[PDB]
Amino acid sequence: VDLSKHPSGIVPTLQNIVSTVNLDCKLDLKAIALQARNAEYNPKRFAAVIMRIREPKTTALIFASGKMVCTGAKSEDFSKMAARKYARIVQKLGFPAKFKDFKIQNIVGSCDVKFPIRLEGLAYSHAAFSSYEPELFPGLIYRMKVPKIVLLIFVSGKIVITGAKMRDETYKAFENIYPVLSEFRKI
């Protein structure tokens, strides 16, 4: 375990990657929904072809403008491999799709500090960063400014870390919050 990059000794696990790419070419969404297989389309509910592949396990949102959203991957590279596979499926349907401006847009991670947390005390002493309303949602919402990352912190000690575009931002946010969480361990 690289304690130079993770002084806490804990490495958050990447759970979800959102990326975007531009095929540059215009698409016929209705025709794609007829020819492609694992593909749904209902334009009066949403203006995109929803397509899924098995490996990497992802879901694509494909728009008539040529833009594509890839969701569900476990790593930045699985997200790119998936986006290329969808773009290849689009190319085998008669469309001159390209792979322009691929970009990681969101990285979701999670981890466990292995001790309970007094969420109320954390919200009290960090009122400017925290939103905690247990009657609405059992997790405390921590809006970290540097880096700009949102953390969902639970009594169990599990944490959700979302909003990063580089994984180092996921790790840095967790390393910033870890000594704060230790200050609010529950008996």
Next chain:
DNA sequence: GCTATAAAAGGGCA
């Protein structure tokens, strides 16, 4: 299943 969080995308609607 709701409740909450981030992000991208487009049509539809006050």
Next chain:
DNA sequence: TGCCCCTTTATAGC
């Protein structure tokens, strides 16, 4: 302008 449509994923108490 602002928002939900819509997709993903962890987390957990209604």
